[PDB]
Amino acid sequence: AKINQPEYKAANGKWEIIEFPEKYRQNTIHAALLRTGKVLMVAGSGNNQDNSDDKQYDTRIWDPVKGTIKKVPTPSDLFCTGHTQLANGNLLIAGGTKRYEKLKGDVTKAGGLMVVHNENPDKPITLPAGTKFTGKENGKTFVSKDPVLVPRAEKVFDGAFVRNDPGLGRIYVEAQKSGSAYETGTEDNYRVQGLSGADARNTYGIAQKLALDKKDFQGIRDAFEFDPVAEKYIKVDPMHEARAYPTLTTLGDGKILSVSGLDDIGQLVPGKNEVYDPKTKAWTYTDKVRQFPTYPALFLMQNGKIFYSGANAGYGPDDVGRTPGVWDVETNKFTKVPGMSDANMLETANTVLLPPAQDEKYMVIGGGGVGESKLSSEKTRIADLKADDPKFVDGPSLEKGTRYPQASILPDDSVLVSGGSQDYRGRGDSNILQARLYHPDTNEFERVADPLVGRNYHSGSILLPDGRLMFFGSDSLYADKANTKPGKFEQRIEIYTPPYLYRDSRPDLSGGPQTIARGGSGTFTSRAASTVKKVRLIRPSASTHVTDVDQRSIALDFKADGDKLTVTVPSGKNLVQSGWYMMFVTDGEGTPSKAEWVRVP
Template sequence: MQHERGQHERGQHERGQHEHGRGWARWGAAAGLSALLALTGAPGSEAAPPQGPTPGAVLRGEGSRDRLGEAEEGGPRVGAVDRRYSTPAAARRTVHDEHARHRHGSPDAGTSGTGTADAATPAAGEVVLDPAVFGSWRRTSYPLPVRAIHATLLRTGKVLLIAGSGNQSSVFEAGTFRAGLLDPSTGAYQPVDPPHDMFCAGHAQLPNGNVLVVGGTRAYPSSTAGWKGSAKVYEFDVATARWIARPSMAHGRWYPSSVQAPSGHVWNFAGTDEAGRRNTRVERYTTTTGALVAKPSWSLPQYPGLLWTAKDRVLYAGTRSSGASGQPGLYHPGTGAVQAVTGITQLSQRRAAATVLAGDATTQRVLVLGGGWPATSSTSVVDLRPATPVGVAGPALATAKAYVGAVNLPTDGSVFQTGGGTGRDTPVFESSVVRGSTVSSMAPNTVPRTYHSSTLLLPDGRVLTLGGDDAGEGFEMQVEVFSPPYLHRGSRPIVTAAPSRMVPGTAYTVTATAAGSTPVSAWLVRPSSTTHAVDPNQRAVRLPATRIAGGLRVTTPSRFLTPPGYHMLFVNDSLGRPSVARWVRVG
């Protein structure tokens, strides 16, 4: 984690105010740094010789806050970038040509489509990708009003954004911490500034829809000490938009992960304590009383990639923000015993990787995507159903990257991944959908998303991307939204009636209309609460369903698959189009 020093405080360099989508806004001392950046061609080709700056792989100037190098939590400043994905224009050309080659044997000189009103207007001569095949991106008309380091989709459809001190030492010293509620459909913003520095806290949604925030920053690094974590605990009340103080933890946590159990309680792991040491204690936040209960300890790296499994165990998948991976394993919440999980590939390169319970959570399939350092294009898959789960190599992404943003889509068990970079100053413009062993290229993002960026699925089926913190003075303030191909295929089904509350094991009727098609499936999707490419509670579940006149009869799975709280209920038709979601409280 890098913090800004002296003359390099935020000021005028927020990139919401100027150029976006062509890489970072300013070039550094290119002659001195270009040797660090070997832009490569296609996989397997030799690295090109060092050369001047290339759009989409911009280096920040000397004298920035980057003084700790690759060992720092945020990752290296620069890394090798595949030329094909070094700019949005190059990436669009790559996606177009590879799709044409796959279909026709060789790329043609034309475009793959004409676009729609929802697609961003391309510059003259640029390739246009058919949105019905590749989806489309649109930058919003509003910039972010706050540094979006932590992002949580609320049951109101608004997004809680937390900056705290925002990775700025001067803001920390001034005590002017920031947070707010963003309406992604209009850009309306309501400040809800926090009572302490929640920068680099852990967070999870509670059964009542409120947001639990644990830890944060107690002190920035000095010449003699490193980061120190706060022990404070707060709950954000969605109904009143106010922060409620809860009992503090036994010790501080900076870079922790918070995971909701099937009971609804939230278990808090890892982080750096108030003395700058690794916090190995595990504490359960009791949702009914706010009490914190000590549980068997577990030593984990910072922001570990955790998931609560259907077997009532907590998986650590080897992904993390910094430090050595340690042994991936399954933690028993009652005894603290950890069963080793072997076979997850390239553990040394899984920092800033994404960990997702991929597709239908019933299948208990975990997908690990990318990571560093150096950045990798590899993925790994763990099937949690066997008595002894073992990881295997998964399908490779199109290019190497860390800081991967990943969300479950609500239609067919696909995971959409986007953004990332090979370093904080070297973004990659690449997006794809991963389903089983297949990776399908999507339209590339046009705004760089590296460190401190977030990706969330919205109730209307679009994907919101925001944030990004390079190694210098800037923070990415431009918001960009992806519309998957299913939003470019005509009229969507409309849910006309659905329960407002669902109990596990109980059947319900959901009615829906679909023009020229038939409702065929329903999914519950847990809303995202993410930071640093970590989202331990994201999941999607396909509901057991039978067709009935006018809709579906669905059954809510067990609490081990759908933990208590608010979920988005999507209905899909026979043409693969999802409805706008209805909010449903489960449990």
């Protein structure tokens, strides 16, 4: 196909690779558009064992207008963090990792770390090599290769006796036979074969997935605010819980909820959630437990409750926190939302609050089966949360089952859905080089230009102020279709220019940056004011692991008079979260202006 011709671009847009000078390359795993118009690109150690060992941590700031890039000193391994924009435009970033060593054993046999629990405070227990552990739910058996000493449970005192904290002993376990049939994909509690009586009651294992991509993966408590003006990470109070892969999401009071993650020995945080108050720069536990898998897609609804779409990055059990629903964080009540197709393929799915955000329609896109499953979903599922009895209904389908699809809201109310892979971490060279625009008004997909670079695990996408989009990342497990050689992280970046920039001249817009309060108005200059049909306030993305709880596009009422455009911000802090937004105006041809920045107090 002649993809650079004017007619083709007018219908399909165009992709371009940017490669950075080698000095500035990194394995970008998170990115966020900052209110300065620059993009924060966070690698941390970049899922690179050498960098993890050396404590080599990387961040960049990229100026898309100037093309320039700089390094930012990175104080901790911010790979594996959660992050969201605060009301002042700083990016709260919390959690991370201190380890993800590849585990040694037979590469053809499922395995990983078993955390053995000893509830007996009176004695330790040693389990010899060749101890068999059987998943109480999964029915699968794994064998240790070395002995493990599990310490006595530690008595905890006020000095009155409270309880016993179980002794914990980690040990590598492996399937007896080769092959994927012996893998697990979710946490289970494991029976230790050969114990009886008290030892049986008191000794059991907990393990996350025991499969072929084997890692010892541990969280940290660190938290920072990234200040986009200073261009630096500012240390704030650490979280109470160590968390690799938490979601951070803004509540109706403007405080930030931190949910889930793996703890400091690789166990799922057991529903112990916490709230950051930006006014105190401190964290407080919520009162009651509510457990989810990692990177749960959690969005603030107009009634102040949190919508969990079901999309997540995995870990934890298959039967807690896996159903979509509406969570009242203050009461802790959770009400499941029915109707999700491919409810067994929600790991690595994307979630978008469709434009306009007023409508409270959420779309879940693609996904795959738990852990290293070969299952992948071609479906979209849409829930309308304004309904009295909300439910998911299928939307338009993709051509192929797709893990890891990128999904970015555009200023014309389309959603760009691109990339992903048909299988786990792109294995079998399964990157899908396809892009589509979802049109909420027709409920259909329109195929657009194919991306140039494949993007699976550890990818993402960011809408820029000029209306183009940046795509980053991709961490294939293997380099080849045969799955014999290790993959190399994708360091190339792409810019996608949508069809709307291959049309007539775009509307002009000036008068930013401005502060405009909810329920208030601001006036801008546009010579093309009388052509404007839509005004959108779009929250900048913070994207990682197929998860972006920041992006949303809010419709604004407006009036044009001559070259003056007056816009009014909607009421409701649950809708228009405080913070910085891109304001785009779009004409009757569907062509957007470049954005002006608007701060909502």
